[PDB]
Design a binder for this molecule. Structure first.
Ligand SMILES: [C][C]N([C][C])C1=[C][C]=C(C2=N[N]C(=O)[C][C]2[C])[C]=C1N([O])=O
Ligand SMILES: [C][C]N([C][C])C1=[C][C]=C(C2=N[N]C(=O)[C][C]2[C])[C]=C1N([O])=O
Ligand SMILES: [Mg+2]
Ligand SMILES: [Mg+2]
Ligand SMILES: [Mg+2]
Ligand SMILES: [Mg+2]
Ligand SMILES: [Zn+2]
Ligand SMILES: [Zn+2]
Lengths: 372, 567, 567, 372
């Protein structure tokens, strides 16, 4: 009766494209159409590679049959909406595997697991997977697979204002992030054939479940400047990141998944453009349901008077901008030395920001000449 | 005395300390010590007042005829007084001779690691070292008063028990305080006998070979009553010599009554301040002992006993100044202690922190500053995007009407690499001042170099408005330091423009080519002036629309207001 | 020199500074200045060392024969040195003469409002006031270094532009720095001509009527290179007089090259410290100019030019001391600034705050202290509930065996109003020390009066254990201040008990009736010693079972552990 | 169909006993048996008096028919358990009406409502109802009526450890306090005949609902020392309680309801003794269900080896003790001058604490003589 699995566990039609997975501009939308998009099993397939790559299938003895059984049941729960669907969950999963298993210029490494490739030869090139035990990372990878699970398609401010049953239930405090963690964990304990975490202790499964919930709840944006303020207070005046501390290792994974959640305007201009049509396509739907009730349509959520460029320029300067400055002043962004340091991720942010300032200039200047 | 010079075209507090001699060799061979002391103390009061209330400039008429300052210097008694109030002199003072005047440009005192909030010429809280009474300097009087406030008084250890120690011949400081305790109760003293004790932190001995001895006790006593009362209490014996040979002074009866009246008079005049529930008084007791040679009275000896106090005891009021409106005053004893004991608020909410933590500016670009944002990115047709017209609705309505204003504002911002001007219907009421209605609007250009300018526009061909713009530039310079926390040197220039219908010209006044400043006043930082301007407006509760950071995106996320006790 | 006296029965660091004259009149008429200076500097090094490493006592053999201290005092050159290191002397020093010795009981330096962490006899970081080079005191060198660390260097404003100022004849300090810039490049100087400038914060002038002039430059130069480099840089001209009449010195050739070698030798020996990325060196340049009278060379004039630096520059190493294990050493320049630049951690979690927040103790009962709790409320059968036997499981197993121990512990706690003794299998390893296995157990009684005692029990009739207990009482006394933060005076007494089977007697040693202390050391506070003991054990990571606060109730309500980076 | 109301709204058999309601030792258990305990309508009856007393029925125009309709539906939801039942909710409601509407020696008063009696004549006797607007107090009174609503009878640590469906739902973070606020508010919006807050704005009902939820969540004990530490940081070194601030007025109602929630060992010895048999009677039930599953029985929850005195002495010294010290050092406890200041509430705490130390002494000493 329950969703169990597809018959062949690990498909192989999608080979020669998982090989170019160690690159920041992973062609996610080409792997989608590559897979039969009628059903959708990308999340379980991208997850099996990144878990096989890290080597967590042996360090914890995770039965592969029950593993794929779960993650296939996970992706079926992700609704069919324009942005917060099973493709966004695969992009946020990949982005945390990249940020934690790639060379960081000037990182002092110290149960651990390093990436399959990693080409470990330098002493100035550390990776975050060598500063965090494998338990904290498998929690961070499972927290990213199920972090928008069963998304209604609306934002928190909409559920709160309209008094949705999910908002009265969770008391108007992280109405969605509490729902993704509850509804996803509740599906895990539902059947016995999902328990891929069978060879764990009682104290491990308690610490594992704690880190998974504390990461799915850091992807809330109402608590954005609280995290960014806390993170700068521990890299500016403190002794730095104390990789022996467990609160500091937690705050570094709460930023690593915060940055991976909003990582659209840090990829190539073609990838960032596809996502942006995704999110506003979701907003316009909310404006439809918001106007059919009598409530004034929200800013940026009016498909008749769109402001797609105004929204993306406020987002990059207000939200994504100051978050990468914090994650970069702490010396954690993966880059490369210049024989001073090159950053591919920060460069796309600068290029994409300037791209929208043209669209706003030519749209105000042109508009000004018409209306005199 | 010291009067605020209100007849100057500086946008700053100018004090006119009178006439002052100057030069190393001129001050040295000056044959009037009482004058040279009075001139030095007059330039020290002025320099202390300007440090406490924004900044300013001290103007002193050169007294000696031929003075150069390029071959004569300043002095040496002056240089010491400057260096006692300030740790680092070149960070606060700039010296400049302008024809027949000597000017000193004082920066504003700013909170530093020392924890001091105001400067003081002398605390006048004495303390008792091993043998001598000295005055508490700034950092000692701060740590002496912060402990008293913490324990709501002062914790003494009254003799609840004599400690059960071994029995061994040992000499300590209580041996001197004990011997003097029995010399005190002695009814008669034999002339030219020996003392069994010397002076220590509980005993003082004064010779005072004086004929009057009353004009001498009037000015040396209250600093010894303050020393003893501020630490452990003690005794003070008057009428001995240096060889510890008791002599006394040749005093006849009916003068000891006046003396005891003068002693109790001066001691009840000394200020005090209690951090405790009760309000005691300075407990003590005087006494006179005969020094009968063998059968005749040779003189007398005054013995004074001061018991340890519960709170502070001043020899005089705290010698700290400030200029209130004009006619610089002296800080009262209640105001002085509230600066040395209390803190500042320092709220700095989480959103407000990231607005300022952007300013770390390591040796890297570190883009995305949040205090330089704006929705409308199109003003000044021929240009790039380098000026932020901040209110964005007052700046728009003001440009619709006043057809000459927009083209004048854009022709004015031509020579600026990067800045941000902030309009306002009146910048005087924004700084808590009186408004005049003849002024059309205002502005404040904060560029990289070229210190902040204050444009005052108006269309009335009757006035000049030199008093409005200058007084508002003055108040803005003080709020930026005393409230905004800007820790470098600032001058606020001024321009006044006439804006009759059909015309954008007639710059009525330009304060930049009217007053000369030191070299360092012409270079600002422009990221700490926006930070400083932000906090000054917030503390004044005048933060409405400057620093846009539009909240159409915040409302979609659900984030709350910027900061207040309003939600 | 200064050696740690290891032949004393004090539970403290004793330094033996050698022989020292004493008394006001004795030190005054002492006919050897070089001796009196060396004795004063020896008692100042010792007093600085003890302030930095816990506390201690300075022992100095009286040199003059008939000294009393009750009719002779201490001296005045000594009292000044004491009062320069310490703000308030009576809070730190106690003086006592014990037969043929003079003892000074030094408290431990504690963090106060000033923000200083260690004491210094001299920073040796000079600064330049208006005309004279002076040394940065403790609070100036703290604020000069905390800024350099903050900006990762020092922000100068190299001439990016000359400020567009009005055109008016004005005289400033750059006029002197400009005239000296052209005197520097002058190839020849006419004998007995006039200077167009005087000395200011960029120019120094030295006469130096010396025959050698090289043993003089060796000791006066590095404090002027440090003054200029630490503020704005400047010039130093050697070979003038006081009347500004250029003369020079009678220097023959073949000596200027030695001079230039000595000048460059002394300047490359001066210590420096960089807060920046690159590591520059002290840039400068010397020069020699002839003073040809009319056609003959009359002498020479050495012109030195020091450019402004990017970081600190010392004239010598920082003159701050500390006693490491024995044989008191001088703090290296890398450790000295690390005290002057960095902070303490100060974690103090939310649960930990309320464990100490009980200690406000206003004039009211304010009951319910959390550091004095225990489940078992029944030991010592004849008594009330006034002693907390803390570990509660080590204190139970130790009482099961050792049948004489329990009755001895209860017979010992009879004369205590209220206290708390804390057992341990060994109190030496708890303080990070070496353990000896002959010691049965230990204890620590912390009562209201009667300073903390350290009982050492053992059953071996061969040793005495005076070295174990005394060294552990010493280490516990320093951690209570340097780590626990106790800010008053402490002494840790000691008792050693022999505990053979069938008998609880034979107190082998009792340190209380063996050493005499000052009066104030016999009274503690007992709520700040538990607070201090709590933090010392936490910083040492030895906090296991003392301070019970049983977690059977906490587990019912899900409250977490006390504090660590373990959850 | 739904629970609507009893036919006569305000009963009057329970008169001459509501008159002695302005006293700290309110005989709650005598008003219980006075009312017909077969059904249970004490909470709606004690609420109508305290609301009529304060004068909130006119300051907000609260329809009495819909008011009593709600609160009767509220008390029926309170389960029938030994401690957390509809009687405990009436005791916590009364205790906050007392603490906020009684003379405080040395309180500087400044829409407000004072108690019906209050005998306002002094200038040294202020009451908290004159420092807090009526909206913040009606929220504090409605937050106390519904703060243990639908209590399962188990503690948070039990729901979390046994993985109860309420713990997976709320992510093991305030599993019970989130449930009382959600399940109570969800019943309010259920029917239209419960909306007694009809004459309120949209911004008022948003601020009202916020304060009600922020008070029901402060009655969690896992966050005890966080509040007590925060409250001492604002009365010790700050400028004191700033009654013009809205965060400070909130923190004073979060302590006022925290203290009123645990107020057992601050009443007379007869009242405090009845409650204590209540709470341990609840613990023993949990030990039964906890032993029938295999889990080790919790401390103090073993009805065969009871430690009723050990529990109450740890509670008063660890939890209730340091909370009244904080609420007393801030000068807010209602007392009386001594012609120095008398405190009835703090005196019962001292008397009751000494009462259990006898029971522990005579139980260890006696036990010691038996076991040698
Ligand atoms: C309400 C969600 N929203 C925050 C303002 C949002 C807007 C835009 C994007 C967005 N913009 N550009 C892109 O390229 C794709 C995503 C990151 C994501 C979010 N979000 O929080 O998920
Ligand atoms: C688990 C609930 N618990 C905290 C330890 C608790 C114990 C005892 C009492 C209690 N003890 N004594 C009494 O008189 C009645 C109540 C206040 C109340 C609670 N509680 O949190 O509600
Ligand atoms: Mg989400
Ligand atoms: Mg997401
Ligand atoms: Mg509850
Ligand atoms: Mg309750
Ligand atoms: Zn007093
Ligand atoms: Zn350097």
């Amino acid at each position: 009766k329950p969703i169990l699995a597809p018959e062949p566990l690990v498909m192989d039609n999608l080979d020669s494209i998982m090989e170019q997975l160690n690159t920041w501009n992973f062609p996610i939308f080409d792997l989608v159409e590559n897979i039969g998009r009628k059903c959708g099993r990308i999340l379980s397939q991208v997850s099996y590679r990144l878990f096989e790559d890290m080597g967590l299938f042996e360090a914890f003895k995770i039965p592969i049959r029950e593993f794929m059984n779960y993650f296939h049941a996970l992706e079926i729960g992700y609704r069919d909406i324009p942005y917060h669907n099973r493709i966004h969950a695969t992009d946020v999963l990949h982005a945390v595997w990249y940020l934690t298993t790639q060379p960081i210029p000037g990182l002092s490494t110290v149960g651990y697991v390093f990436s399959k490739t990693y080409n470990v030869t330098d002493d100035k090139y550390g990776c975050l997977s060598g500063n965090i035990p494998a338990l904290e990372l498998m929690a961070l990878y499972v927290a990213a697979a199920m972090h928008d699970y069963d998304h209604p398609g609306r934002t928190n401010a909409f559920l709160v204002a309209t008094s949705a049953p999910q908002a009265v239930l969770y008391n108007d405090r992280s109405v969605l992030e509490n729902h993704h963690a509850a509804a996803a964990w509740n599906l895990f304990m539902s059947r016995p054939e999902y328990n891929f975490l069978i060879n764990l202790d009682h104290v491990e499964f308690k610490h594992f479940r704690f880190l998974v919930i504390e990461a799915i709840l850091a992807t809330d944006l109402k608590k954005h400047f609280d995290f960014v303020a806390k993170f700068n207070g521990k890299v500016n005046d403190d002794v730095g990141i104390d990789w022996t501390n467990e609160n500091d290792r937690l705050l570094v994974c709460q930023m690593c998944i915060k940055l991976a959640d909003i990582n659209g305007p840090a990829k190539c201009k073609e990838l960032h453009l596809q996502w942006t049509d995704g999110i506003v396509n979701e907003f316009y739907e909310q404006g439809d349901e918001e106007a059919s009730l009598g409530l004034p349509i929200s800013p940026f959520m009016d498909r008749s008077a769109p402001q797609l460029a105004n929204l993306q320029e406020s987002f990059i300067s207000h939200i994504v901008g100051p978050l990468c400055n914090s994650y970069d002043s702490a010396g954690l962004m993966p880059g490369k030395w210049v024989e001073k340091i090159y950053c591919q991720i920060t460069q796309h942010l600068l290029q994409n920001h300037k791209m929208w300032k043209k669209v706003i200039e030519e749209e105000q200047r042109l508009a000004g000449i018409e209306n005199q | 005395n010291i009067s605020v010079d209100l007849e100057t075209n500086y946008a700053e507090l100018v004090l006119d300390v009178g006439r002052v001699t100057l030069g190393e060799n001129s001050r040295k061979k000056m044959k009037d010590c009482k004058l040279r002391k009075k001139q030095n103390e007059s330039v020290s009061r002025a320099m202390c007042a300007l440090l406490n209330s924004g900044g300013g400039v001290i103007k002193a008429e050169i007294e000696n005829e031929d003075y150069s300052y390029t071959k004569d210097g300043i002095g040496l008694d002056l240089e010491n007084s400057f260096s006692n109030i300030l740790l680092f002199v070149p960070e606060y003072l700039d010296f400049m001779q302008n024809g027949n005047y000597f000017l000193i440009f004082v920066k504003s005192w700013s909170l530093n690691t020392s924890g001091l909030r105001i400067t003081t010429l002398s605390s006048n809280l004495y303390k008792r070292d091993i043998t001598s009474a000295k005055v508490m300097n700034a950092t000692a009087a701060l740590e002496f008063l912060k402990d008293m406030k913490k324990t709501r008084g002062r914790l003494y250890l009254r003799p609840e028990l004599l400690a059960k120690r071994p029995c061994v011949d040992i000499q300590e400081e209580n041996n001197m305080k004990a011997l003097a305790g029995v010399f005190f109760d002695r009814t008669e003293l034999d002339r030219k006998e020996k003392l069994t004790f010397t002076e220590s932190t509980h005993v003082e001995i004064k010779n005072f070979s004086t004929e009057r001895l009353l004009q001498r006790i009037k000015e040396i006593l209250p600093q010894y009553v303050s020393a003893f009362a501020n630490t452990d209490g003690g005794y003070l014996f008057i009428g001995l010599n240096e060889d510890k040979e008791i002599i006394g002074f040749k005093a006849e009866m009916s003068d000891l009554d006046d003396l005891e009246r003068e002693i109790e008079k001066s001691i009840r005049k000394m200020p005090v301040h209690h951090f405790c529930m009760e309000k005691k008084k300075i407990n003590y007791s005087c006494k006179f002992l005969g020094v009968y040679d063998k059968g005749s009275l040779c003189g007398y000896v005054c013995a004074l006993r001061v018991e340890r106090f519960c709170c502070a005891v001043f020899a005089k009021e705290p010698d700290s100044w400030h200029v209130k409106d004009n006619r610089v005053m002296q800080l009262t004893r209640k105001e002085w202690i509230q600066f040395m004991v209390e803190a500042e608020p320092k709220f700095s909410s989480a959103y407000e922190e990231v607005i300022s933590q952007i300013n770390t500016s390591l040796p890297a670009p570190h883009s995305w500053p949040l205090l330089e944002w704006q929705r409308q990115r199109h003003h000044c047709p021929g240009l790039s995007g380098r000026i932020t017209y901040t209110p964005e609705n007052l700046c728009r309505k003001l440009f619709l009407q006043h057809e000459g204003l927009k083209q004048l504002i854009c022709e004015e911002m031509s020579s600026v690499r990067k800045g941000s001007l902030i309009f306002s219907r009146s910048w005087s009421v924004d700084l808590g001042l009186q408004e005049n209605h003849k002024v059309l609007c205002d502005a404040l250009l904060i560029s990289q170099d070229s210190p902040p300018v204050l444009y005052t526009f108006h269309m009335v061909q009757d006035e000049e408005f030199k008093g409005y713009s200058t007084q508002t530039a003055l108040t803005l310079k003080q709020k930026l330091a005393k409230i905004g926390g800007y820790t470098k040197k600032v001058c606020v220039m001024t321009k006044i423009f006439y804006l009759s219908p059909e015309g954008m010209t007639s710059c009525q006044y330009d304060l930049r080519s009217q007053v000369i400043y030191p070299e360092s006043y012409y270079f600002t930082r422009r990221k700490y002036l926006l930070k400083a301007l932000f906090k000054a407006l917030k503390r004044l509760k005048s933060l409405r629309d400057q620093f846009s950071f539009a909240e159409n995106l915040y409302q979609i996320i659900g984030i709350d207001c910027f900061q207040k006790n309003d939600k």
